[PDB]
Amino acid sequence: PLSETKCTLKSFTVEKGIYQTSNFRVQPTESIVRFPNITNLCPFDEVFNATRFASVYAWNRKRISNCVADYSVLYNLAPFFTFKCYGVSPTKLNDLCFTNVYADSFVIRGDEVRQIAPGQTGNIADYNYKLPDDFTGCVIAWNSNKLDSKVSGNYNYLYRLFRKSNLKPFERDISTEIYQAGNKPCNGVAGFNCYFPLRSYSFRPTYGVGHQPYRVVVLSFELLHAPATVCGPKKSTNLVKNKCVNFNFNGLKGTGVLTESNKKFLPFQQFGRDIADTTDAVRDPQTLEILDITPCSFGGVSVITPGTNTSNQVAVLYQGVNCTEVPT
Amino acid sequence: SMTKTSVDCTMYICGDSTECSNLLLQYGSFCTQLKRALTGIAVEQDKNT
């Protein structure tokens, strides 16, 4: 602590007086990861491996919740053509936890497959499928041209070119209504001032990249709108009380001391916030208990010494911290 | 005299993470100026008494 005076002041010698040096550092011991016990894996193979799919104008939205996810086919193993994520880190998929997911299954040809991104402009990117700027999820594509193609072409899958205005995202168009430019009524069929928006895909194996069909499944993640029951295979440890430790509580991380809450709380409450809007209290995921969070490493270090021409003895002042409980 | 306060940059800016303490050193002596300014207030508040 004589040389802690020389380190903070950036000087070779010591002047006589009292100098503020540093603060306490309390190292955490263990790490606590809490996730509830669910023996059911998530049905990710039902949306990927199914025989018949839907179109780009009307898709099949599969709500998947209250399970344990398997990300090893989407991260370590690569059966699939490309991995495109935007707001989520692909390595951190197994770390973070979300409530539910909405899978959108649609087949887009390889010329038009570059229009799937937030904030694009195109035929699919205006009148069919959009993404918002706050969208959270990933885009997974795979080449289907050895299976779903046909020599004469596959007209069973369909798409719609035309719409009167720009379509809002997360909305399916089920309307069979003929697009009417003028004042002539269509009466269900094409004609003068009546165009038919519904088209069929170009899919053949013999042609190039733009005729190759791709199976695109886009996942939509919902973060902190609800309690989070869905993430990867993370383990679980015991709760440690009266110790400064690292926290992982349902994806939320921190450092503190777990103490018992004496107040009356909501049964649906996941966590709660202080005057600074940080989490001071959180419900346990497996059993119903709410434990408070009291942070560690508080108080300063002040030294009192004579200078280098007098004596090397250093008196150390701990400010604000009781020394009955208790720098290298 | 008035109330003598001292503000640490470790607990206030950082949420006890290792990335925040590593990127604080790229800004350098900005918190060296603030701790010497609050020290020089607290010397002169004892000279007022």
């Binding site: 603060n23 600074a276 009291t294 942070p295 508080f298 108080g299 300063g300 400010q319 604000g320 | 005299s1 109330t3 003598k4 306060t5 001292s6 503000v7 640490d8 940059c9 470790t10 607990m11 206030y12 607290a42 508040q45 004892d46 008494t49």
Partner: peptide, 22 residues
């Protein structure tokens, strides 16, 4: 007439000793 690292420095001259000079 807190946990974020905000420390209130105590005064050197206590209010009992201010009245001793008074």
């Amino acid at each position: 007439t807190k946990f974020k690292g905000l420390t209130v420095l105590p005064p050197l001259l206590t209010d009992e000793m201010i009245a001793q000079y008074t």
